[PDB]
Design a protein around this ligand. Structure first.
Ligand SMILES: [Co+2]
Ligand SMILES: [Co+2]
Ligand SMILES: [Zn+2]
Ligand SMILES: [Zn+2]
Ligand SMILES: [Zn+2]
Ligand SMILES: [Zn+2]
Ligand SMILES: [Zn+2]
Ligand SMILES: [Zn+2]
Ligand SMILES: [Zn+2]
Ligand SMILES: [Zn+2]
Ligand SMILES: [Zn+2]
Ligand SMILES: [Zn+2]
Ligand SMILES: [Zn+2]
Ligand SMILES: [Zn+2]
Lengths: 396, 399
């Protein structure tokens, strides 16, 4: 690493396969009904598809939530040839729940062809997880190891909006379901003990290029830190941050806390983009009291005087005041404005959480990664988590 | 067993300890947050208390939901033991439980006069011990015995008190904007077992709970399947514990055997939550269905509701009967009480555990309702049983 300021952005467009978009993210669950049901109301992502006993699948229970291009898959084992996801392992899924509580199993990329992505990845050092399979109807599926037991899943299928999530999934449209304006996955972040081997491995087999980086001096506190690199596809629409702890500090790094509590590497957080995040957050906050998500404590009021100074030329007073009311973090550069906020942990352990983001700018379609990653927001997020961890420590 | 019609109601008040009320039900989870979150908005039972890392407990993560006297506890192991608020918790047993059963009830808890007394009287009358009595501090007592399979009967005792915690070490939660949908109390908790006779003898034996009602396959079965049921009751008939067994040799598998097969042994099949306005409650619950709330079994056909008009039209308004029809509520009536009952579809992934919303109308006697008002109805049970059988058939058609 050289640090955020010294990193010269480039884009060689070195992808080894066509990484078109995030397709979905799959959580392996103790109970898919419980997780999907909670997430549906908490995020405004209505049930869109199911594959389970009611669809003839006795191998696994899968529920798909959608908010526009946000697609969350919740899969749990029952107590085989009927599986709609042939990579599914009941034993592994059962162990996963015990090992982590709620957490991400698979990060799915839509690719031109699953077999080609798999072949190109494995020829450039990817560890195979699931050999390519024809799912029928022109669908391809393959998986390789991403970090720890999280897999990178390749999905290919013909263009067409009649297309099922996957063959064997049955559509759902609930009378009176609503969304809260979530549009797409923005980024998916992994925590690992050692960054350099994982970054080399993933960039190696994907051809994904460095989009950004952050050292402890960029985003850490007096007491703790991390190092981060973000890998990106050619269009910089698929963004995969990677964090490692830094050791020898006054406190333990929140990334090491994660590894300790999670029981190994995994997805720390998933960022969900909205075209009006302030509106989205108003809806999500209304559901907080009745089992929805909560948000990390906002910065003090003086922060929001800074937001005026730094971003008052792009954001209206109405938006800035709403940012303050909702506890949103604001960062800007010459291309974009970043609005970001983090939930409290979404399961039992202080591990996995979610992020709501809006990128303002770079209108052309919007250019991928508009506004990049904000050093200012990053350092506030990090401080936020550190403070959260201290509160937990204060009650021992 | 002689069946519902020939069974002669008698209350010997033979409780071997003071069974004051249901206190809570505990679900052991691999993921407590997901279940508690969904249940909170599905049931209108907001988070009321927690014991977890944020309260200094590094042994288990516990969330308590409350709607008035309805109290659901969700507990999961963390990935220390001295920081537990529930000293009977075992991370190993909870992990095996979740792997074996998925989302399921582990503990049925009664408020008793004293936990040690309940345990002592229970064990002396044959109860299999699960957790020896312990003092939790603040005058709280906790003890456990085996109920059926892995499910324990938990005894909780504590002083009468305005702002006493659920259990010592649990911190209060009050969300601004929290609401409830009018659920008031637990009505009954139902166990499915392979053989009713030994379990009924065991529980009645150790508790001194008396027979409140019974049903045979001829009472409630279909042309293709059945069950047998007995209901046990405390002295006040406020704590009601039905027990179901399968009947064999029929054209289809009993839904009770379906439960055992998919659960992997005996367990809690369903829990009935009472409301003083179940139709009002159900409207609220149904408004949440589209966004991840619970769903309900399909209503019976119109001719059934022509039935409820003839059977109960004298004591129900047309508005109530019409709403029962809209919502798929089943209606039964005896000489004392009217029963309004409806079942959810399975509440987790497996077609095992489900919930019931019930209202009992009558037996008003300050102002209090007599326990067990309306008893259990042969009519409603038959239709609930038929609903499950129909549900199962829809599942099988998709193979
Ligand atoms: Co982020
Ligand atoms: Co019932
Ligand atoms: Zn794992
Ligand atoms: Zn490997
Ligand atoms: Zn810790
Ligand atoms: Zn910058
Ligand atoms: Zn900045
Ligand atoms: Zn005592
Ligand atoms: Zn005594
Ligand atoms: Zn078991
Ligand atoms: Zn049989
Ligand atoms: Zn089955
Ligand atoms: Zn009767
Ligand atoms: Zn009747």
């Amino acid at each position: 690493l050289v640090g955020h300021r010294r990193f010269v952005r480039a884009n060689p467009r070195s992808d080894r396969f066509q990484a078109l978009a995030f397709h979905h993210v799959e959580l392996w669950c103790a109970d898919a009904a419980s997780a999907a049901g909670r997430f549906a109301f908490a995020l405004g992502a209505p049930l869109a598809a199911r594959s389970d006993l009611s669809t003839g699948n006795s191998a696994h229970a899968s529920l798909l939530l959608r908010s526009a291009s946000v697609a969350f898959l919740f899969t749990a084992p029952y107590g085989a040839t009927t599986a709609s996801i042939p990579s599914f392992s009941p034993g592994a899924a059962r162990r996963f729940a015990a090992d982590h509580g709620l957490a991400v199993h698979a990060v799915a990329l839509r690719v031109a062809d699953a077999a080609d992505a798999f072949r190109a990845s494995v020829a450039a050092g990817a560890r195979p997880a699931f050999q390519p399979a024809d799912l029928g109807g022109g669908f391809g599926l393959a998986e390789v190891e991403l970090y720890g037991d999280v897999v990178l899943r390749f999905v290919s299928h013909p263009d067409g909006a009649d297309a099922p999530f996957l063959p064997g999934f049955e559509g759902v449209s609930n009378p009176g379901a609503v969304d809260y304006g979530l549009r797409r996955f923005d980024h998916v972040v992994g925590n690992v003990p050692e960054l350099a081997p994982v970054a080399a491995y993933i960039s190696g087999f994907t051809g994904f290029h460095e989009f950004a980086e952050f050292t402890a001096e960029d985003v850490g506190t007096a007491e703790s830190g991390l190092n981060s690199v973000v890998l990106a596809n050619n269009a910089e629409t698929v963004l995969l941050p990677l964090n490692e702890p830094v050791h020898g500090t006054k406190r333990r790094s929140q990334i090491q806390t994660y590894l300790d509590h999670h029981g190994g590497p995994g997805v720390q957080h998933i960022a969900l983009a909205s075209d009006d995040v302030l509106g989205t957050l108003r809806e999500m906050r209304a559901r907080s009291a009745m089992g929805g998500f909560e948000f990390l404590a906002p910065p003090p009021p003086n922060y929001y005087d800074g937001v005026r100074r730094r971003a008052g030329d792009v954001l209206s007073e109405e938006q800035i005041n709403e940012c303050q009311e909702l506890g949103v973090l604001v960062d800007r550069d010459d291309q974009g404005v970043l609005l970001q906020i983090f939930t409290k942990p979404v399961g039992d352990r202080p591990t996995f959480f979610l992020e709501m983001i809006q990128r303002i700018g770079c209108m052309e379609y919007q250019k991928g990664g508009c506004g990049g990653f904000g050093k200012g927001n990053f350092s506030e997020l990090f401080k936020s988590i550190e403070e959260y961890e201290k509160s937990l420590e204060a009650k021992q």
